């Protein structure tokens, strides 16, 4: 690869995956710049842990991982190392040790259909907490009482996935914020993704 890494494909994609099935895209064997990502909208939260967002170009890595999903305004701060929340515990567990960046910005112009955009969901109820950097898809009912409900939408037994549409009449707290997570790791292999 002699041209730039396809961060335009992961940032300017026409659709984003939902929270409960967040994408895991791998960038490898590509010369990276990290110089074109400020051309987008002013970010709501552009925060990096471990590596400061100034020495990205001259620091050399071996693999880049990109996570991509869309979350409400009230839960942007939940995506953080050592945080407790509805997405922080049940949908996306960021580990306490985290070397990378989290980028959350506003997309209330093409990612919110008037009257409801039910295309995005999250998982409300789970049997336990979630291991860090893990995802799962559930299509069966979750029970909470002392009876196995086993597939009837009744009492004390509920569907796990809950949708949340984005009408434009909503305020800042319930707009769809697109958030990506750029993750790096230690040098255990010869470096290939590196600055020019």
């Amino acid at each position, epitope marked *: 690869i002699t041209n730039l890494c396809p961060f335009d494909e992961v940032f300017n994609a*026409t659709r984003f995956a939902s929270v409960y099935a967040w994408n895991r895209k791998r960038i490898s064997n590509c010369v990276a710049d990290y110089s074109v990502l400020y051309n987008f909208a002013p970010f709501f939260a552009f925060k990096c842990y471990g590596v400061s967002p100034t020495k990205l170009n001259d620091l050399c890595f071996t693999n880049v991982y990109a996570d991509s999903f869309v979350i409400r305004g009230n839960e942007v701060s939940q995506i953080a190392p050592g945080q407790t929340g509805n997405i922080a515990d049940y949908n996306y567990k960021l580990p306490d040790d985290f070397t990378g960046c989290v980028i959350a910005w506003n997309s209330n112009k093409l990612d919110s259909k008037v009257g*409801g*955009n039910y295309n995005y969901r999250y998982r409300l109820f789970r049997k336990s907490n979630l291991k860090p950097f893990e995802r799962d898809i559930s299509t069966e009912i979750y029970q909470a009482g002392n009876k196995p409900c086993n*597939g009837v939408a*009744g009492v004390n037994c509920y569907f796990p996935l809950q*949708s949340y549409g984005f009408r434009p009449t909503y305020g800042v707290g319930h707009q769809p914020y697109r958030v990506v997570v750029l993750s790096f790791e230690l040098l255990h292999a010869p470096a290939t993704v590196c600055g020019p």
Partner: antibody
Amino acid sequence: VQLVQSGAEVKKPGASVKVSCKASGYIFSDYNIHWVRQAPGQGLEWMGWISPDSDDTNYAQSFQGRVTMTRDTSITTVYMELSSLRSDDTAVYFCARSVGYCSLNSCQRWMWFDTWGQGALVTV
Amino acid sequence: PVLTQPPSASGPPGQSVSISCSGSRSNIGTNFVYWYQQLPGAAPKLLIYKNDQRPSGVPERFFGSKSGTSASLAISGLRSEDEVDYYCAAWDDSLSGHVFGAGTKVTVL
């Protein structure tokens, strides 16, 4: 809202017919359009939906090689074609505006229709 | 699967008549159900959404809920405007389509 679709003409089997649905009074690019037919001796039968912002559509497991569904932006009308029609397709055709916006097969549980339209007679 | 429901409703006018809509576990019990009525020579119109709510405009005299695999609709009184067929619809993942009921023709006595 206003949702009136054009009439249809009785046809002979082994031909293609065009049924057009017209939408007005709302933003055409922020809703879904569903095709549902009424034939005698049976209830409503469902075919598929079109998202009027891209090409991503879905069909039914029964209507696969007989229906092709396309969209338009400048007229804001949805065009649906019936191919290789038989004697079991004698039905009136409803185009229904569905509230919300879904494009996946795990999304339709909240997809309840909002406004329907007056049918157009199609006969073998 | 295919939704099933009785084609005829038996009851004198002036009191409550109950009708049921039965399905399966992959059809009902995971996804919600909705109700429609079809006027003579007219499009279907909404009755119940989210299994227990009523839209703005419909009469508030119609009550329906699901108790399991089947869902029951309760109507109060039979007038001429209530004589149209009532339809039951839901969504099932196993066929990736909107399954609909067969119909219930109600007649006054």
